[PDB]
Amino acid sequence: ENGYTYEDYKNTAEWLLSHTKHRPQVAIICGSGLGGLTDKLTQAQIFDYSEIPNFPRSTVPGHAGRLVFGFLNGRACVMMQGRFHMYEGYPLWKVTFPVRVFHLLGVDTLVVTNAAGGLNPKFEVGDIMLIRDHINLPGFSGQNPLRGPNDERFGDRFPAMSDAYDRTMRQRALSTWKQMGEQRELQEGTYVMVAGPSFETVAECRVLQKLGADAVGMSTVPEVIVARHCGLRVFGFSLITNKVIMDYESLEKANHEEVLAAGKQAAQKLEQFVSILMASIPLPDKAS
Amino acid sequence: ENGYTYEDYKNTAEWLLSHTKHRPQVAIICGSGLGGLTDKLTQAQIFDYSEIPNFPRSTVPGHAGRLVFGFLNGRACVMMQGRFHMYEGYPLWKVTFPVRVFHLLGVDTLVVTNAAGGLNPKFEVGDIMLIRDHINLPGFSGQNPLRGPNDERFGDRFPAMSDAYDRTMRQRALSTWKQMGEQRELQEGTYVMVAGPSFETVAECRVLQKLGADAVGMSTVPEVIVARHCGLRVFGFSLITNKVIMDYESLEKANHEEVLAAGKQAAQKLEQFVSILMASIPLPDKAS
Amino acid sequence: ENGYTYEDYKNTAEWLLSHTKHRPQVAIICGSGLGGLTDKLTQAQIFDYSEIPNFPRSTVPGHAGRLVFGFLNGRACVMMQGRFHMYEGYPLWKVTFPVRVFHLLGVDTLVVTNAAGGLNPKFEVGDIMLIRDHINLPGFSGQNPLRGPNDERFGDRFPAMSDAYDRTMRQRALSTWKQMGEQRELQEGTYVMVAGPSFETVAECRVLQKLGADAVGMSTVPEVIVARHCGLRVFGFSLITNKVIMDYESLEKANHEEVLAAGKQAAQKLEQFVSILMASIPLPDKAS
């Protein structure tokens, strides 16, 4: 909760509204290599985190990090290309700042994407995992974006997370994947957040396996938590960018961004899939 | 350890001694809905955390948070109605400040209570679990109230916790419950501390189960740790306010305070039980 | 990463170079009771963390903490007697500061030692465990020395840890132990870092067991992580100073430093073993 004040969020939201003709319904957070979704926008309007009032700037990426407003397959959007991570030194109340303002912008849904490691054996690099649940490791210890005094204007003190990833949207995505006639099916599993920049050891990969994680990553969870606090509908996917060596074996899949079509294609498929899913996100106009 | 200085504790203890005629032997920390224990006090003297010198004030509850000195079933007490939690933004050295001063007040025993979720299947809401052990999740990562330079005037650098919950007092409570002729028996199990305001997900509830936790909560453990550091006898109970859905099922037991007699009665029974147990806490006068 | 700046490291390294005629190839970090290794140095030159420019001073130990440059069995060394721990209040970027400067000193290898508790049943106090892997509990939550913006001059953003403990050096130590004709064999297993000054409870010791930890301690891991970031060859051992009671049993092995020959001898054997291993650390001169 800390760091910002309610008026901070209000001021940042008003600046945006007074600077963009766009009134977003959907907010989309792009993971690594997934930033290309911005190219699918019509009537796009770009914003530098930098020029937006209380918006945290990027530590190094910067240009990789910007806010784009536009239209994606029927929905008014605002995509965040280049998300914040706590390993970059960002306290969780900064990492989630966007979501809080997106809420005060009118966004009622948040689709989140992230690149992850494959813990579940059946996954194979290139795969896309529809996120059904999560294990918040940083949270178990105090690293929860909601730590601090709660603001009832945003939500409750003890919000439930057992129902964060929308079942309706999850069944809708499951159907849509079938509808597309996709060869390999849409995977679905538990995501485990782990901070720190460095990569896991076989010993650690095995405890995550034990804990029941299907994919491991260093983001998403905080943003999802505050989104739910605001009452926003939340759903997302994880792009498996490498299988995880859980057995004392020779290293492999070191790089993930420079992997040719292995990345390119897989990222490409998720980005379009997400666009098609815009037709499945309930219009605020109570469409039936 | 950080934040306060030894003289801070001494100054706060002396202020209390010079402001209350009471010389407490027992300190009792009330969990949620368990604050009614204060009504069982004779010759009660109320203090606002606010007016006590270095005492951390409440973020919002405030009035729910106050220090009451009195007499409970034969013992001189000081009950803390409305405890501090780290999810409220309190660093652990503030959350435990009370215990440290209680020590310099003469308190040689600390009974702690907390409301928790039922992880062990056999538990049923309303149940009371005698705490036999704990799993300190925030501590495994650095969140231990003792982090910082150790003060030998309070205790050692590496205090043992494998024996925090008194076996004598635990057998005494086990007997007393029988003595009362209580229908359902006194449950006993491991408590798992988890920070953060939000509630667990099925995925997370399952790892706690795996870890061997019988009840989950967001407090108690830090206070217990510093109490042991001071050498105080420690024992407590957990009031199961809801069973935990560890299987992909529809939500339930959202509310806990507004649950009619479900809360009322169960809280009522624990409060009296604790009073009866005052007769079991060893008098400093080496009674035999 | 935080706290210091690159020039801070450069300035501290230059001060050392301009104050010592020694040009260390190997850096050795001594655990508890293992500080006697300093006595095996020839042409030793002592430094007080205190007098070295940005070097964090000791909270209490102080005199137990000093930097000694000398020669050990063929290698130019710099031993750190009295390491920093996060439970002492040191942020991880201070705990690892040494390693970062050791790198800018020319050190291409780091041998780390620590005293630990025995989780694996087959271990028996006195035993020495060659570290093959680790489980970074503080890291899973944000406590990773690399948190903050990454410096490419030291290393990458996402360094791999699945290969931190050198297999070559691990097989070399395995051979050397045999070569010595040692009675009991060299143990090898996973080390689990746990912060906080206090000791584990049976409940907690059982989760570590479940997690697959063979030894538990409150150090080593951070130093290893930054060493790898710098690209240094890393290897180390853990001296089992007490078996861990993972079953509800009477306490035992409280003390570890005051345990007569139990400590003395075991520490003695590890210290010499480490010296013999100097002959196994690859000379920068591409010896073949």
Short overview:
Chains A, B, C: One of its GO terms (biological process) is positive regulation of interleukin-2 production. The structure is a homotrimer of 288-residue chains. Chain A is of the alpha/beta class and 288 residues long.
Q: How would you characterize the overall build of this protein?
A:
- The structure is a homotrimer of 288-residue chains.
- Helix content of chain A is 26%, strand content 23%.
- The relative contact order of chain A is 0.20.
- The longest helix of chain A has 16 residues, at 261-276.
- Chain A has 288 residues and is α/β, with parallel strands linked by helices.
- A five-stranded mixed beta barrel of chain A has the order 5-8-7-6-9.
- Chain A has a single domain, classed as Rossmann fold, CATH 3.40.50.1580.
- Chain A is globular, with a radius of gyration of 18 Å.
- The interface between A and B is medium-sized, with 32 and 30 residues.
- The PDB classes it as transferase.
- Keywords: Purine Nucleoside Phosphorylase, drug design, synchrotron, transferase.
- The assembly is trimeric.
- Crystal structure of human PNP at 2.3A resolution.
Secondary-structure map with pairings?
The structure is a homotrimer of 288-residue chains.
Chain A (H helix, E strand, L loop, with lengths): L5 H12 L8 E5 L11 E7 L17 E7 L2 E7 L10 H4 L1 H7 L5 E10 L9 E9 H4 L26 H14 L6 E7 L8 H10 L3 E3 L3 H9 L3 E11 L17 H16 L12
Parallel strand pairs in A: 1-4, 1-5, 5-9, 6-7, 7-8
Antiparallel strand pairs in A: 2-3, 3-4, 5-8, 6-9
Helix pairs in contact in A: 1-3
